[PDB]
Every structure is written in C-alpha cells, then in structure tokens.
Amino acid sequence: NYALSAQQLLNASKIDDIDSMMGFERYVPPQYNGRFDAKDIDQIPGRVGWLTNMHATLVSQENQGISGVDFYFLDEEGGSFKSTVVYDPYFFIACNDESRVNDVEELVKKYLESCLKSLQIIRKEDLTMDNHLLGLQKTLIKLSFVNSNQLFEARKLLRPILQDNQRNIYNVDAKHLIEDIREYDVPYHVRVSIDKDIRVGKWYKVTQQGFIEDTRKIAFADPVVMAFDIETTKPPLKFPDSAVDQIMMISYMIDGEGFLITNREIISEDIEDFEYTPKPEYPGFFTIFNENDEVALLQRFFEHIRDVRPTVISTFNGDFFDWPFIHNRSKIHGLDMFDEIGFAPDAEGEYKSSYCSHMDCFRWVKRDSYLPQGSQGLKAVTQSKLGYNPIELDPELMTPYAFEKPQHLSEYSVSDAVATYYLYMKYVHPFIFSLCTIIPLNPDETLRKGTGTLCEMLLMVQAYQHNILLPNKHTDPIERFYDGHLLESETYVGGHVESLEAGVFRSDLKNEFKIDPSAIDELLQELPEALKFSVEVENKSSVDKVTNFEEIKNQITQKLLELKENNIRNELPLIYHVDVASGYPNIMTTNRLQPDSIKAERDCTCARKLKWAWRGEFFPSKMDEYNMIKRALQNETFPNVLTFDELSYADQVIHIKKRLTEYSRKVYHRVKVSEIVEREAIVCQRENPFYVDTVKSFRDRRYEFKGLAKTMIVLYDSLQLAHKVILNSFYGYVMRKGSRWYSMEMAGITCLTGATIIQMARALVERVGRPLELDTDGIWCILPKSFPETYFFTLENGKKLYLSYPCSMLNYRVHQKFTNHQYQELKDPLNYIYETHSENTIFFEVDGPYKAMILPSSKEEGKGIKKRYAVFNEDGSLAELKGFELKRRGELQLIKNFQSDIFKVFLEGDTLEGCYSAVASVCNRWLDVLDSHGLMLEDEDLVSLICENRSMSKTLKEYEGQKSTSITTARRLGDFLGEDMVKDKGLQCKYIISSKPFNAPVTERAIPVAIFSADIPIKRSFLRRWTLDPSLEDLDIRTIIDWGYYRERLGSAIQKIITIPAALQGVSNPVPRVEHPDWLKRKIA
DNA sequence: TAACCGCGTTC
DNA sequence: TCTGGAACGCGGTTA
Ligand SMILES: Nc1ccn([C@@H]2O[C@H](COP(=O)(O)OP(=O)(O)OP(=O)(O)O)[C@@H](O)[C@H]2O)c(=O)n1
Ligand SMILES: [Ca+2]
Ligand SMILES: [Ca+2]
Ligand SMILES: [Ca+2]
C-alpha cells in the first residue's frame, strides 16, 4: 500500500535524526536565479565539501514520499553536512512498431493512472538494431514516477501484459505492440549517480543549481577514521556464542590514537597505559578504560563513537563476528545499538550506517589483495603488507589469560587494532575511495561488490554517456541440447598449459642444446626488419636517429651464424620468462572484440572471421530416455503437495538432470560425454567501440602504474594489481551470469587466439633452445649463453633504447602473423566516414636471467607436473614459488615444512649430482623423523607437523551422501563438542590419521586433534569409539598415528621434486631410502 | 580399474 | 535476491 512509503519515511526520519546527532544536518543551498558557470564557482552561493558517502532515501513535500539521494559531505571548515537531490526513477518501454508509439502511449496512460507521473518519447542508440551505424535510433517511452515504489508498482502491472504478448479467425490491439521494458532494474542511487555525474571522493560546491565539481581541490579531505577489534569469552575447544559469551575487551584506534576498554568483571586487573609500536611508522599510544561491567564497556564504546563522530569504522571480518556480537550483547543488556550509534544490519546481514561507511578490511583481502587464501588471515596480511609480525596468542588461551596474565591478553588486543587501523589507511582507504571517483557506488558497495559487477558499473556509465540503450540482463538458458543430448555444461577451450621438462636447471651447470639450423636461417632473414621493429614500434623512435643499428645488427648476425654451424653444444644456460603483457585485454583490443561486435549472418569488409573452440558436456542418454525420466517424474509427487508441472521449469530440469545422471551411471557407466567443436564467428570492425574503449582506458591506466618501475614506495604496483583485478574480470564479465553484455564466442576467441600465439612462441624457442613450462601467455625456458641477448641502441639524443632479441624476435613474428589490418574507426561522425588501419598491441615481456628453476615430475610415466615450479634470483633469494602445498591453504604441515627447507638447498653444489646429494641430506633427515616415530620431537611440535587442516566450504549437512576426512572430522567434532561447532560455514577441520581401524579407509580414520587436548576421561571414550578398539589404554599419539601414511606422503613429494626428476636428468636415485616407481626401474634397463 | 568430486591454486 | 573465466594437482570416492 502507501504504508510502504510510511515505513520508508519513518526510517528516513530516524536516519535524519541520527545524522544530525553525528553532525549531518541537511543543508539547503542559498537561492540564486543567476547563471551557472564553472568558472564562477567561487561567485555562485553555496557550500563546498568533499563527498564521503551517499544513500537513497524518501522525502516529504517541503502525501506520498519523493525519491532522492542524501549526499554526505566533509566541508573545508572541519565540519560536515548532508545535502539531498531529488530525481524521478524511470524505465523505458520498447515497441514492436514505431508508427503507432502514440497509440501505445495512450494505453499506458490509463493502465498506470495511479503510478505514472510523466511520459516522454526518448531516442536512443540500439546496438542490436539494423543500420544503427548510419544514424538510426530506437524510439522509447520513458515512464517516470514520484518514488521507487510506484515504479515497482508499474512493473507489477505490466507483467500481465508482457506475459500475454480475441477476434474473428476469418479476416492490432494497443497492448500487443509492447515489446519489452528496459533499464527497469538499475539501482536507484546508481541511476542518480550516473545521470548527474556525481561520484564519492570528489569535491563539489552544493548550489541551488546543482553540484559543481571543483577541480581545483587536489587532495582528499581527512575523515575521522576508527578501527576496532573485539575479543570475547570462548568455550574451551569451542567457538564463541553472543548468547552466553561476554566481551572481554574492545580495543580501538581513532585517527592514530589507540584506546582499549576492559570488562573488569572478566579482566582481573586495572591495566595501566602502555604503547605498542611495531614499526616506527606505526605509532601506538594506548589509553585504557577499565570499566567494571560489560554494560559500562558497551556504553563507553557507544559514547566514544558519538564523541569523535567517525565517518569510517574499519574492522577485520567485522561483518561476521564483531558487529553481530556487540549487537547481541547490547540487546541482552537493554541497549538498542541503532538508537546509540545509528548502526544496524541490512538485508545481507552486514552492518552499515547512514553517516559512516563500515570498511571490513577482510573484504579487500579476499578481492583485491592478490594473496593466496592460505595467507588471508590478519597475521599473514600484516607481514606481507605492513612489514612486521604482530602479537599472537592461542585462541584456546585467551579466555583463561583474562585472569592469569591480563596484560598479555591486552597486548594481543592492541596488536589486532594497530594492524587493522594501519592496514586500512595504507591500503584499503586509498584504493576504495579512489575507485569511487570512477564507479557510481558508495564506499560500502565499492568495497564489497564483485569485480564483475564493478565492470558492469563502468560499462553502464559509458553506454549512458554515449546514449546507448542498456541491454537487459542475461537470462540463463534452462535447457540446451546437442545432437539430441542434454548438455550439462557449455564452455570454451581456454588457456593452453604444457609441462615440457622437469629437473634442476641452474646458471652454473652446463646444459645440452641442439639448435635447429633452419631456425637461425629465418632469424637472419627477419633480423633486419625485426631490428627496425624494435626501435620504431617497441621504443617509438626512428632508425635514422640511431647511431649503432648496423653495429648491433652485425653483432647479432655473428652469434646466430656460429650457432648455425655449431648446432650441437653443451654450455651454461640462460633462464628466462617470456609473458604477454595484459595479454587477454590486448588480444581483445587488437581484434576489436566486444560482445555487440559478434554477429551472425546479417546484411551488415568488417568480417574479422575469428575461430574459437566449443566444448560440450552432455548426458549420454538420448532424448527418448529423457522423456521416460520426465514421465516417471510426472507420476511422482514432490513437496513444497505439488505436481511436477506445478514446479518451476528450472526446478524440473534439476530433477530431470539428477535422474538422468543416475540412469547414465548405470546404463552407460558414465555421467558426462565431452565433445570439442571448432567454431567461427564474425567480428564487425565498425561497431560502437564503447566496450573496447572502456577496456582500453583501464589497460592504459595500468601501463602507467607498472611504468612506475623504481630502481621510496612500491605501493604504486600495489595498485597496478588493482587495475589487473578489473581487467581480468572484464574478460570474465562476458561469461558472467546475469550480465547485460554476454558472448561466449568473444571469450573463446580471446583464449584460442592466445593459445595460437603462445604455441608459435614455443614452436620457435624449441628450435633455438629448450622450453621448460608454458601456461596461457607465459613460457619458462633455458637458452644458450651464446644466444644474442641484450642490446642498447645509441640515439643521437644520447638516449639508450633497450633491446632483448629473444623478445623482439618473437614480437616481430607476432606483429607479422596476428595484426588486425581490418580495424575501422569513425573518422568523421557527421557524415559517417570510417577509416581502416592496422592494430596490434600484443607484446611480450621478459623476466631474468634467473639463477635457478626447479620443476617437479609426475609419479606417472611420461606425464609432467604443470603450474608448479620454483625460481631463484641471481642473489639466492626466492623469485617465484607456484603451486606447491607450502603456499596452498590447509595441507599436511610436514610437506609444507619439508618444501620450505628443501628448495633453498637446490642452489648448493658444484655439479648436478652434488646439488641432488645436498638436497638429499635434508630428505633423509625428514625421513629420519618419520622412521623415528618422532622420538626427538615434543608432543606439541609433532601434532603441528602431523596435522592437516581443511576448510569445509559449506555446512556438513550439505555434504550429505559424501565421505571425506573433513566430513568425518566435523562429525566427530560434533559428537565430542556438540552439534553447535558444526553450524557455521568455513569449518576448519584439523585431524590426524590413525592406524586403527586397520584395513579401514583413510576417511574413517580421521581423528580431530582437539580430542587430545580434552579431559583424560573424555579422551579415552571417543578414541575408543573412533579406533573401534575397546581395550585401548595407551593414548600417546605416537601409538595411534599411521606413520606409514605420513611416510608415503613424504615419499611422494621426494619422488616428484627430487628422485624422479634426477632420473630424467640422468642422476641415480639420490634418496635410495625412497624407491623409484616400477616403470622407472624398468626404464633404467 | 575408469570416472568423478572438493578444494585451492596458476593463468 | 548477487553472482568474472578456464586449466590443473592432489587425494580421496564409487561401482
Ligand atoms: N585472476 C586471473 C588472472 C589471470 N586471468 C587471465 O589470464 C591472462 C594472462 O594471465 P596474466 O599474465 O597473469 O595476466 P596479464 O593481464 O597478461 O598480466 P601481466 O601483464 O602480468 O602479464 C589474463 O589476461 C586474464 O585473461 C584471469 O582471467 N583471472
Ligand atoms: Ca581480534
Ligand atoms: Ca600476461
Ligand atoms: Ca606479467
């Protein structure tokens, strides 16, 4: 009813009251009936402020509310204010016929009498419309409304008329010309922010005309920024519960000033003031508020937020723990957190306020940090991004340390707060607010929304600003068939990966090369052109201004000629990485790839016929058994009591696929059948390049960031990764569900074209050297030391121009075989003149030379290991480590600690055999611990090394009908500590494999490690039940551990990184205590 | 055995 | 409701 506007107006009245309490009274700008000129900004009457936030709202006439957006400002005088803007929400109607739009308009004027406020004829460009490249536009009816509810009230009324679309059959209505509705699902506050070009993070003069952007102001304003971490009482071996657990202490930092509140009914002593300063750039003075009760703690917390009026509250995982814990504690205690500090949970359950953004730094880590999930806890993030190791305390030991050593518990509390404040200010604050200047979202949404949604935001701004009609969101095809088979998956062949060699490759050991002579012949033929290519395209200069071109040319010709006569050679190597820079982006731009450019047979040489690969996974069942399964389901009854037809089409196909899955598993002994079909698609080179240019803009931006190559802050590159996070999702947005611009064809052209390029690079490197590993756009390789390497052109300006022949010899061939000579661009739009030119932004980059690269080998004959290796810089430091369990989250700590200790030893020795002998000494030492059943290890160190931690993605209940060590652990954790420990997601499952039950699967022998920290009577009872050994009396873990399972695991690793690779390099087993697979035993003969 | 799955990584 | 992609290692399951 109209009550929705009453509820929403009552919310807006309490928000206004809270805003005023926090210093955000509404500012109405002074009247001026004079002209608005940007140069007159100081003359126009108004208020100037830095935009920090923005929220949609409902306002009254100053009977139903009017939609608007409050904008929250920080003024130059240190104060603050908010200012509202009113804007009628709207969406469009498209027609089937443009000669009868007025007939359509009349009908809509009557059906939506109680909804419509305005109606207007708008013209927009439709990229799906014929001859739209010659100026043709689509006519639309723009329906406007007072507030957002009346818009949704219209959409509810138009759904009947849309779903329908009687007379004598023997020889139209105004309702049947309504085609679809467009731009109906744009979030209101985004619609306003886009139409008015208003962005958080920019300065404005709020005037009665509008917001006047003040480009003179360069820096951000300085908001009051606050961060806090809460520590609570925790049941031993169990998780905390707001229902029964109190808050020990809240620790927080306002603007570099640290504060700590203690609950004196849980904290055993009044704590005196102290300081925690980890690095001198992170100063932590801390003042303590030793309050007696939790009430006095929650109230001091609330009173302090009201005092400092903070516009940014930062947390670390505060949406899941801190905020809902404080909320529940305050509700138990009669406090209403909303009336206190204006904070409350929203639909997604996160905690937000109107006057203040809540910045959970965990959301930044997960999305934009480019950190492995095994390093996304606060401890790791602090080390990698802040540069110190913070205070640590066993969570099993926080609750009792409240009484025994209170100061120690407090030292941990401040540590969490100091890390969170400075992590926010040095990383999340600059990136999020700067991203708000280009993305029409408030800080809360810019921090949390998926990168795919950030891309749609950027693309919608371009579409609106070129008057391009938005496409509706993609609707997923519920069912699709191939050759009569139900497809369970449609996809494209993506990156090309190749393991080519394993073993140890090091700059101080010679390698055997066989140099194709025909390869050097070609390289000599293309050398002159490719050499001009380096100065004029790679370096953007002129061969005439060079002074050493022929010198360098002759020097390169010699090294190649020698390697032509002297083909077979045994010399020291050149370890190199070669990668295409912004590869997938540049491939799309070079080829002018955008979803609206992919078209089928149409009148529309703007061909760009490009190839992609289609892979389909279909049920082996034919359509006839599909119908049988359907009819069988129809004869069945489903719950909500519901016939199969009463169900939604999607739900029906879920059922059909499930029963079809079981039928194929029996009758066909399979579930899916894969078939790869090569396909071709047309890419028009004259389409509106709004998508292509949006990617081009962000790519050129990241080039600048990377161009900040320093040889004192490197955080510049800490943001180039940010541009990459957006660019990568620009390639993925085309396959995203619910996308407005979708084309599998475009994503497949990008992948297949990239594979073609990387295989061309490999095809020549193999004829000139030895390629080691290849993945998507990169190639790890070793080249002879006598191959032409680095050269500097001498310019008449005294300038020096880099030249890596190995790179430019490939770049020239790329620009010779993959250049788009069909790129067309609008020269003069007034008379529609298009001009064609050749475009190729695809370039390779080089890394190295590197001291050492270690590549592991498979346990299966012939196969290699992909996406895993270790590289070392010439100074001994670790350059790259990829794939190994050391980095991965939750692996057997023994393998992680063995790998950390083993890789650095691959640098010692003066021969390939001596390297393996030194690395084997470390292997035998680890084997000694496992064969010593941990005799020289403390029981604590042994559990740490022998425990494997796994994170259950979902809840145990959703894993029904499935067996896993994580499931068995979580089930056994429930039987011992209650069903409450298995309620939240992300359950970390720490377990140990037991020897008994003998002859039993590993999954049935996963004992949770928390049982060994339990009471001695509780220990035996559950161990007995889990070993199936009633006689059990000994409980030393050394007696229960299946030392053989752990020895086989250590052995598998030794075989893949050392023994089997050594055999492929000719060396004999360097760890005979680890025996070779039988196939390798046979090969030695 | 061959086919498949969950997790967490490299692109 | 909100929601970028595919290729790959490893240790387990099932029938
Ligand atoms: N999280 C990621 C990382 C990479 N890619 C894809 O992998 C391609 C190549 O990977 P990479 O070389 O890491 O990306 P580039 O953009 O080429 O970056 P760089 O300049 O470092 O080579 C990217 O273009 C992108 O399409 C992706 O889709 N998602
Ligand atoms: Ca904490
Ligand atoms: Ca790349
Ligand atoms: Ca790179």
Author numbering: 29 to 90, 111 to 213, 219 to 224, 233 to 665, 676 to 711, 720 to 790, 812 to 1185
Which sentences from the paper describe this structure?
The Saccharomyces cerevisiae B-family replicative DNA polymerases, namely Pol ϵ, Pol δ and Pol α, have been estimated to incorporate about 13 000 NTPs during each cell cycle of the yeast genome, and Pol ϵ seems to incorporate the majority of NTPs, roughly four times as many ribonucleotides as Pol δ. Other examples where an amino acid adjacent to the steric gate residue influences ribonucleotide discrimination are found among B-family polymerases. It was first shown in the ϕ29 DNA polymerase that B-family polymerases have a conserved tyrosine (Y645 in Pol ϵ) that functions as a steric gate. Our data show that Pol ϵ discriminates NTPs through the concerted action of a steric gate residue (Y645) and a sensor in the finger domain (N828). A comparison with other B-family DNA polymerases showed that both Y645 and N828 are structurally conserved residues, thus reinforcing their functional importance.
Previous biochemical experiments showed that M644GPol ϵ has an increased propensity to incorporate NTPs, suggesting that M644GPol ϵ might more easily accommodate a ribonucleotide in the active site. A series of crystal structures were determined of M644GPol2CORE (the catalytic domain of Pol ϵ (136 kDa)) in complex with dTTP or UTP and dCTP or CTP opposite the template dA and dG, respectively. The two structures of M644GPol2CORE-UTP and M644GPol2CORE-CTP aligned well in the polymerase active site when the two structures were superimposed. In both structures, the NTPs adopted the same C3’-endo conformation, and the 3′-dideoxy end of the primer terminus was at the same distance from the α-phosphate of the incoming nucleotide as found in structures with a dNTP. Thus, the NTPs were in a position admissible for chemistry to occur if a 3′-OH group were to be present at the DNA primer terminus. The described structural changes were also found when comparing M644GPol2CORE-CTP with M644GPol2CORE-dCTP. However, a small ∼1Å shift in the backbone Cα-atom of the catalytic residue D877 towards the cavity between D877 and Y645 was consistently observed in all M644GPol2CORE structures when compared to wild-type Pol2CORE structures. Here, the M644GPol ϵ variant allowed us to solve the first high-resolution structures of a B-family polymerase with a ribonucleotide in the polymerase active site. Instead, N828 in the finger domain, positioned on the opposite side of the nucleotide (not facing the 2′-OH), had moved 3.1 Å and a loose hydrogen bond with the β-phosphate was disrupted.
